[PDB]
Write a protein that binds this ligand. Structure first.
Ligand SMILES: [Mg+2]
Ligand SMILES: [Mg+2]
Ligand SMILES: [Mg+2]
Ligand SMILES: [Mg+2]
Ligand SMILES: [Mg+2]
Ligand SMILES: [Mg+2]
Ligand SMILES: [Mg+2]
Ligand SMILES: [Mg+2]
Ligand SMILES: [Mg+2]
Ligand SMILES: [Mg+2]
Ligand SMILES: [Mg+2]
Ligand SMILES: [Mg+2]
Ligand SMILES: [Mg+2]
Ligand SMILES: [Mg+2]
Ligand SMILES: [Mg+2]
Ligand SMILES: [Mg+2]
Ligand SMILES: [Mg+2]
Ligand SMILES: [Mg+2]
Ligand SMILES: [Mg+2]
Ligand SMILES: [Mg+2]
Ligand SMILES: [Zn+2]
Lengths: 37, 60, 174, 146, 213
RNA sequence: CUCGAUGUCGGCUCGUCGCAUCCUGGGGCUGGAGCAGGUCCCAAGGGUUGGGCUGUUCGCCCAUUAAAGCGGCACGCGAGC
RNA sequence: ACCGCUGAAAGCAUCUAAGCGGGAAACCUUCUCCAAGAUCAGGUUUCUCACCCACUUGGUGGGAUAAGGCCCCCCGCAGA
């Protein structure tokens, strides 16, 4: 994952969810995974 | 406060009740009746409970 | 919309609510479940399952579509039971039964044996094809996830366990 | 002169408190008020008045699900790095009577006389207590309406 | 099934094995014990077995201790210790009155040996805790075996607890783990145990089977 | 704050704590074929060398090492040297 | 940390909101040692299990013992 306080979607099919009380970006491309930290 | 809660009232509305009923007994003697004569303290709660307004949460 | 559909009974020989508790039986075995007490589960004209709720809360609309499919995985979990079809890819990789267990040759210095738990049947149809079968959708899906992660994801050659017809991603290599 | 209790005036009784669906805070307050004697009109702050309190079913007490996970219990041994911690949830597995007892002792005054007050407290994890030689009357949480 | 016996350290010798290697052995006289008492979880809360060892004259054992040997039908012994077992299957093999000999241990087995180590008196921080000490020359003034600093400065204004200082050393309970049983001589009650055993020659020694093997 | 005194650098001895981790342990991504890495995430249980030069701290160098971590404690520690 | 299973809110999807897993030299057990002054001062046992006087008759004050212990004495590889 990428760990930054500013996460946001990169491509068309990145999705921004909130699991376990943290904002993260799940995507099919593995280098687009991000979570806030 | 301990003797009033035996007679299912708080200290709070007991002091409102005795001011409303015109009972000028001070707290020195009201805590002395509560020990030596618990029946007369029950007779003072019923005077305080009756003089209390019907809805205490309603404005004056 | 899910929750806004009454659950039918295909066969369901004992589809009976016993006090915030639902059971099931059909051709295959039995299952149990307990729905959370704000959500109400009821009956259709022919005894089929109906799910209701108190209306318009954040926490009640979510548990309503939740407990709908969890009931309809019992009336479907018995009759039309759940199988996952799994395929071994990679040169030299194979799988065999040793009893009800399931041994793998995945390029290690030892065979990896998967003990089949209760209510789970393993069966092969080929040396690189097999199925995980059972009645409970979660318990079948948990075992098929354990067998899936037996090797590291390889983008370069694609060797290892997969699900059937899934498209793993590939990298260009050297 | 106002009433001061002599030696030989206090009458101590026995109470049992069922702890099945009571939150830990409400029970520890009602046990501490009952061990000290705040409900008797002969209360004096220098006198061990108050009654014997038995707390049964201490494993059942209403603790929140996130308090069992995250609330901590710290102990230090005097040695460097002696800070040993558990959670509430894993103390309820081992010693659920010690969780109920620790909540009551933090609500008592911090003096010598509270050390003789806490000797009248018995906490048991199960529904059964050995003090049937006395007759503990059951105690329920009452709130005098206002 | 953890086994156990009481005995006496008889000192050290050496022996040669089948590959003609020298083996330093300690001679424990795992003498004939007797049971005298069993701890059951219904009576005692836990599970163990007493063991009584050592010839003593019956005029030296006082009246409270003679009555405990009288309830077990045993002549009074000198030493008396328990072998702590696990909770399961307490004493289906141990009976009160049973004599235990040296040949409960086999050759090539492993044993834990526990005893009371040798007394070293009031020891300094170099002997007791392995400190370095200051130097012998280059001006060093009367601190050649002294500890050095014992803490910080005004933060914290104290010495931390468990700071290694001088004091009495030895006479401790020491367990030595995983000792090889080279030979058990059933003719004499003698175990040949590879290596060293805590205590002086003549001291009481408890020999249990090893848990780590 | 202290001038009717609160002894200042380095070393020695003995330490204790932090994590912003040097090694060992677990991971994500990779312009990750492999072997080696780069980067981020978790992790403080233990470990973390001997010398030449300089009063030195620091630094450079020699020979090793799994590694030769960074800081706080009156730039810890002179009623211990 | 990370990887999931089933699964809504939100007809799809989602490791999560109900629920269930995997997971490290860190944490807790297990290993070794201290440990009931742990004043909540514990448990299992065994032994003695007994006199006499005075009194203001007191859960009194003495005196003499039992089991047991201590000092003395001969010493220790135990030790200022
Ligand atoms: Mg950015
Ligand atoms: Mg998690
Ligand atoms: Mg000596
Ligand atoms: Mg030296
Ligand atoms: Mg001098
Ligand atoms: Mg000198
Ligand atoms: Mg100083
Ligand atoms: Mg001065
Ligand atoms: Mg340091
Ligand atoms: Mg960190
Ligand atoms: Mg990496
Ligand atoms: Mg370290
Ligand atoms: Mg550890
Ligand atoms: Mg030279
Ligand atoms: Mg300094
Ligand atoms: Mg320094
Ligand atoms: Mg200096
Ligand atoms: Mg002990
Ligand atoms: Mg303590
Ligand atoms: Mg005792
Ligand atoms: Zn993307």
């Amino acid at each position: 994952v990428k760990v930054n306080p500013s996460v946001k979607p990169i491509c068309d099919k990145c999705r921004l969810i909130r699991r376990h009380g943290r904002v993260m970006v799940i995507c099919s491309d593995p280098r687009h995974k991000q979570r806030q930290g | 406060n301990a003797a009033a809660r035996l007679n299912d009232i708080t200290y709070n509305r007991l002091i409102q009740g005795l001011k409303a009923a015109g009972v000028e007994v001070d707290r020195k003697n009201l805590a002395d009746i509560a020990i030596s004569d618990p029946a007369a303290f029950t007779a003072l709660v019923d005077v305080a409970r009756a003089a209390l307004p019907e809805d205490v949460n309603a404005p004056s | 919309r899910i929750g806004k559909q009454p659950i039918p009974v295909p066969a369901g020989v004992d589809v009976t609510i016993e006090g915030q508790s639902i059971s099931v039986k059909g051709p295959k075995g039995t299952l149990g479940l307990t729905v959370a007490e704000p959500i109400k589960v009821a009956r259709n004209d022919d005894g089929a399952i109906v799910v209701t709720r108190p209306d318009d809360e954040r926490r009640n609309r979510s548990l309503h579509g939740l407990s709908r499919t969890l009931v309809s995985n019992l009336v479907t979990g018995v009759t039309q039971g759940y199988t996952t079809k799994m395929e071994i890819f990679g040169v030299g990789y194979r799988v065999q039964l040793k009893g009800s267990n399931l041994e793998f040759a995945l390029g290690y210095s030892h065979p990896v044996v998967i003990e089949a738990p209760e209510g789970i049947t393993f069966a092969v149809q080929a040396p690189t094809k097999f199925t995980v079968s059972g009645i409970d959708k979660q318990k079948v899906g948990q075992i098929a996830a354990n067998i899936r992660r037996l090797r590291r994801p390889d983008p370069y050659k694609g060797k290892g366990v997969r699900y059937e017809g899934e498209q793993i991603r590939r990298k260009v290599g050297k | 002169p106002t009433y001061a209790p002599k030696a030989g005036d206090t009458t101590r009784s026995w109470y049992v408190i069922d702890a099945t669906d009571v939150v830990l805070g409400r029970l520890a307050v009602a046990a501490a008020n009952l061990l000290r004697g705040k409900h008797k009109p002969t209360f004096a702050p220098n006198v061990d008045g108050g009654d014997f309190v038995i707390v049964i079913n201490a494993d059942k007490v209403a603790i929140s699900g996130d308090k069992l996970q995250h609330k901590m219990v710290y102990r230090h041994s005097g040695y460097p790095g002696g800070l040993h911690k558990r959670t509430i949830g894993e103390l309820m597995q081992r010693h659920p009577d010690r969780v109920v007892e620790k909540a009551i002792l933090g609500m008592l005054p911090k003096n010598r006389l509270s050390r003789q007050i806490q000797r009248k407290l018995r906490v048991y994890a199960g529904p059964e207590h050995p003090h049937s030689a006395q007759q503990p009357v059951p105690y329920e949480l009452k709130q005098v309406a206002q | 099934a953890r086994k156990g016996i009481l005995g006496t350290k008889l000192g050290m010798t050496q022996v040669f094995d089948e590959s003609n290697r020298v083996v330093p052995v300690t001679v424990v006289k795992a003498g004939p014990n007797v049971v005298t008492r069993i701890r059951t979880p219904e009576r005692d809360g836990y599970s163990a077995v007493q063991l009584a060892y050592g010839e003593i004259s019956p005029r030296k054992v006082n009246k409270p201790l003679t009555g405990q040997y009288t309830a077990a039908g045993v002549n009074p012994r000198r030493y008396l210790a328990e072998l702590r077992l696990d909770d399961s299957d307490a004493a289906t093999e141990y009976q009160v009155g049973q004599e235990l000999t040296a040949e409960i241990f086999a050759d090539g087995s492993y044993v834990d040996v526990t005893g009371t180590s040798k007394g070293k008196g009031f020891a300094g921080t170099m002997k007791r805790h392995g400190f370095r000490g200051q130097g012998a020359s280059h001006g060093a003034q009367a601190v050649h075996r002294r500890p050095g600093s014992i803490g910080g400065c005004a933060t914290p204004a104290r010495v931390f607890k468990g700071t290694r200082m001088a004091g009495r050393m030895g006479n401790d309970r020491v367990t030595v783990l995983n000792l090889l049983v080279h030979k058990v001589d059933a003719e004499n009650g003698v175990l040949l145990i590879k290596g060293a055993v805590p205590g002086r020659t003549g001291g009481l020694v408890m020999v249990r089977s090893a848990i780590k093997r």
